[model samples]
Target: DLVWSRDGLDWPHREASRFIEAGGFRWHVQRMGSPAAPAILLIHGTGAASHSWRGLAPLLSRHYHVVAPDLPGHGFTQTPRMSLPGMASDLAALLRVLQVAPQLVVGHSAGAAILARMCLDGSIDPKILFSLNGAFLPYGGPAASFFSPLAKMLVMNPFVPSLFAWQAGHRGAVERLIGNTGSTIDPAGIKLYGKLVSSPNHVAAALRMMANWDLEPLLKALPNLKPLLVLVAAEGDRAIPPSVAVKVREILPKAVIERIPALGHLAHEERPALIAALIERYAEKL
Candidate 1:
């Protein structure tokens, strides 16, 4: 069972709403623009919801049908598994149920990883694929390999969310994590995440997702995968290092790569207009 917070927080957009009988769970989806328009799907990363695109969706919705969903176990959507593959299946199913075929699919952080899964599994045949500060690095060393499995054990613990929530209450901790990317969010957005991270199930689920994630297979499969892929990274993004994108470029030299300076991991939030411009230019070509 999941419980969301109303502790002085509310969805700030009219497009934010729920879709019942969507795939499996009662999906929380943000929709905008007319159905007749070209479809564009936006997938957010871990610990983030459709609200992460609150600044960008409407702007893009003018010419394209924009649909953004809160990933399972995050925001208002429920979860069945902690794996990225599992979450991607849910998204693919939901897209089928919605009767939508997006001309463009854009993903951020962990969301980009899920998009890759969908593409690899033949779930969604997007015409254009885009990634922002994509989190594609698999766990590298022994510490990660050893602790990742152990973290899942603790995530399964019922008491961890409460403890995690208590510590996250400190704005400074949240600030440090989000700010480590060399960017900052407004008070309202920060407060909203503060309310969300306090949910015991949400925190537990986040831990499990990170613990279970491995991008080695996805990176290996990229050469065979084709969809006019575009990879963009925030030059200052600390969460997903620039080197990751560089390595990805070496693997798929055909991919169009761009580096947005000054912004951090949350580049979409930092400069929606600029990101929108990039998408529009790319869409124009294809």
Candidate 2:
């Protein structure tokens, strides 16, 4: 469901390895890799947990140190306030706690929005920040396009969290539409997702993260940021279209735009080696 292994990738799986208190909550961090390598922060999308990075984390860790955190209200990080800004604040605090100064950060889907906020707010340093099929926009569906204000007003309500989780928990329509977020169909993937997405307040946080940012100047912000990469999924991406990523490339002229054919939004999970290679290549050129 949440975790899956692609090809013959090998990794040492560790869950909830570190805990740091931030934003009036105890944020959890799950990492897989050797400490000697670079720290790669795995940020996830809405309705997703740190497990979303499971397959990719261990695989990339072979060449780099990887850390995936359950952002506030997403996985195991449950905050009393349960706001996205709070989650970003918690991550800032966690980074401070870990004393990790030089490292690369990668965010996917809604997790990219948090990364964007972190960049704008100067919470994290300018390193290799990459976004894949990122959910930086705040419109849920067609209804969200015209009446997004209405949805935003109602979503922050405490009751909406469980309602959203119910939708994410028994996500049949989502699987048919957005199931491309995870690459493989393995027992490990299914079990890993079940553990993280099943946690409390996860669905609620997903909603918040989705509604957090507007796509108006989002693409424009990419070029101004530190070195960045945009990975575009070809046909597998149901949530976003190639046209949108192309527009992103226009903004980030120096950024590398690679089209992942036949794959979905979760390109990293589906092809960790490819994604890892892309990162390495970009870093080499940089």
Candidate 3:
């Protein structure tokens, strides 16, 4: 577990950090901008925490009330059920406790799917939903069955997370991992990821989330979604192909698609100003 006293000493945006007990867990949330401003909820992807928005959140906070949270079992947040529906409902309960009803929702990768689930389930209804390199599709063919079970096996082994964390502690290991995503973030961003990967609990939580994730239902119901959906694809994203956005457009023809040049899966982290500008542009329409 990430003991705040030890691991949170130099955390990014530390002044914005707030901990709250809601829905059976202590959530680490970062809230900025005026409470009177229209709320914007920012949800980071799997294997990431609120720090993913270290730059973008501040920029958005200038115009909108921004709220970012370390999802349950990630970062400083305490334990909870890790399934898709469970996370959606739990997050809904947490937002209720915070008295935040976001008018605009932004999510990165798997986080996008969670927000979609929330909207579908009536957990939270935002006027606009933005998906940044979302992973909306499940694995195909034999890998679909193989990956989850493999992760399940790894999760069953108590030693796996510790071993992974130990390996992540080695120099360049986390760098290599991030490199595979085709995104080159700054040293500070890399260091925060290193801190996350070094924690056994965080690693286990990520694995558990991957193991439990199922996106088929979400995909099936996406065409019926009511909110305005915007899909942003990173041209160089290796983690999730930009073509995924094309596929999503096929499913939801009304959804708008935008492509960012020369960036990768962590496009927002790579260029917060660029992403923030795009978001602000969209917010103008709202």
Candidate 4:
């Protein structure tokens, strides 16, 4: 029931939802832009679906074909496993099935992390990679030792998602959770989240994804990753600090790091056109 809703939302291009079986998963995919143009794949963050690209995909479609997919358990995508490797393979297999090759792969937050793993694991080789508020650092200090185990244990509990969904159903609670990331979304996005929060299954999948989230290898191999990587950080992001981007830049000297002012974790939502322009600029060089 918490699957992504298209109601009260408008997307550019003739949008259609189609399901395809690929790599042991059923994918919920939306197609936009022109098939004749270069392809770009859009991946959303944790707790988000392909709908997150509503504001950004259309603009990019002018120069490229944009394909957005809901990751397993987040939208219509179905999967028993939510691990990064598992999800990355699903996307790669889906691309093979769709017969569309994306020149540029754009991902935000955990989505970005998934793309990185995809490249690392040899699932897909992207020409250029754009990471917005890319999530890599795990819980540090007390959280790494304390909160993580507790949270992981809790996710194993069957009733946790139900309690979370019930508590997150209200707009106030949704706002607080979303606003805490330092981004203010529009009413339509908020309404969409309200529906997502009301579904216990959606909540459960998100928790499972987080429970299995791993970035240790990504950081270690950043120094020599083959793809052209761009790291975009938001000045107002509370979910992932801009400082982390700085550290990532230090680790991967070849990476291009850009910081946006007055935006937050949802910078892609706040300035879709700007993000699109930035992405296009990098794609041009490639």
Candidate 5:
């Protein structure tokens, strides 16, 4: 658990932060822009908190109310479960508590899968759904079975998180990890990630989420999802192949696919203005 008094002192957009108890967890959320404006929900990927949206959320808030929450078990949100359906259902309850009916939703990586699950289950009725290098497809071949089990093994070892955090404390370790994803973020972004990776609890939660992750159901149900879908692929992304967006299009023929050149998995953090402008173009269409 990240202590708000210590770990959160210098968090980006600190003034906008709020802690709310809803759906059995105490959630750390950030809300910006006019309350009366149409809401835009920003969901970050696994291992990330609301800080993942530190760059893009404010830019969107200028025109739309932006609501970003640290997903359960990550960041400051406390939870006992990390399963896909459980997260989606609890997130729906949280939104109900906040009284926010988002008209537009943007999700990055695994975050996109969660929103898709929510939409499929009638939890949210956003007009448009944006996927930023989404990890919608499950791992193929032996990796499909090997990934979760390996994570479960790591999670069962209490020392694993501490050991991982200790390794992250080394100089440039976090930067190298981020670089492996094929993105180059600014020092500030790297520093924030460093803080997150240094926390044993955060590391444990991330591993637990990965252990419980199962995206097959979401992929099977995606074709029936109700919102207009837009898949934004980062050409330089190494974490999730940009070609995954093409695969998503195969399942939902009506889905739109857009490409961002030279950016990677954390493209939004690297180039917020560019992503925001792309979002604006779509928002106008709606």
Candidate 6:
């Protein structure tokens, strides 16, 4: 019943319930909490299904109308595209088409790039923005590897990912993801990532975003002195190091960066209650 209600609450029209189309993909969205509640839209990383937000969404649902959509070429969005600009454009168009303007926006991992671009494009005027374990640099690997966009693209392909997964189920996938980033990855959470990343057009899209991503300029394009919140994971954050997040922080001169401790990229899932509470209050302030 929870699944049905969650899936059914949206004003369906085709994609999920209504096949709502945006960017280059067919998409649909659902809202949790009351209509009068402020809107909170979630944008997760590469190959990450909307289900990734399952743990956190319910917590925020009590205070905010939660809207989470699978990015194009990932999850239920079932669309195709690889570039961050393309994904951002698609999300912007989707938000416009859905009439979800002036909503709070949250981005994780690769989704952060799109989030930055989304802010620049002004598709949705986010009163507040949140980023966790987001990948702003091109490849985002372990230490020096973060700058090696070429190696990351070569290694993160569907073939390599599937080949890697088939050889090592969930734990293996999780290890590989966090390993390259030089941190202790959780076998339980990240294992599921491989399958999602292995889905049709997903890996290709990952490669697309990593190599040709021109979001550095988009981030730079934003005017100085804007209010933004950037949450970074601490060291040993297998998903992304606080260092990388600090690098992203440097890009936004006006941003307030805080390091999330004792968690990896999936920190939202690992510690949903704390994350949800922190973000909920932050959203209220915005």
Q: How close is candidate 3 to the true structure, as a TM-score?
A: 0.97
In order, candidate lDDTs are 0.80, 0.63, 0.90, 0.82, 0.89, 0.63
Highest lDDT among the candidates is held by which one? 3
Better of 5 and 6 by TM-score: 5
The residue-by-residue lDDT of candidate 5 on 146-227, one tens digit each, is 7768778889998999999999989989989999989998888888888889888888888787788898778789899889
Model 4 C-alpha lDDT per residue in residues 109-128, reported as the tens digit of each score: 98988898888877677799
lDDT of 6 by residue, 104-177 (tens): 77788777667777777766667777887777765534443465566565756657645543454444555676
Predicted structure 6: clash tally: 8
Residues 182-280, model 2: lDDT tens digits: 344455665455544454456656666556545565555556677465544445676665555565566666665677777777676666777777777
Q: For residue 222, give model 5's deviation from the true position in Å.
A: 0.7
How high is each candidate's TM-score? 0.93, 0.80, 0.97, 0.93, 0.97, 0.77
Please estimate how well model 3 matches the true structure, expressed as its whole-model Cα lDDT. 0.90
Residue-pair clashes, model 1: 0
lDDT by residue (tens digit), candidate 1, 51-70: 88988898998999999987
Query: Between which residue pairs do clashes occur in model 2?
Result: 1-189, 1-190, 2-193, 3-189, 109-135
Candidate 4 has a TM-score of 0.93
What C-alpha lDDT, on a 0 to 100 scale, does residue 275 get in candidate 1? 94
Once all C-alphas are superposed, what RMSD does model 2 give against the true structure?
Answer: 5.1
Worst ten-residue run, lDDT, model 5? 139-148
Model 5 pairs whose backbones collide: none
Report the Cα lDDT for residue 68, model 1: 93
| Candidate 5 TM-score over all chains jointly | 0.97
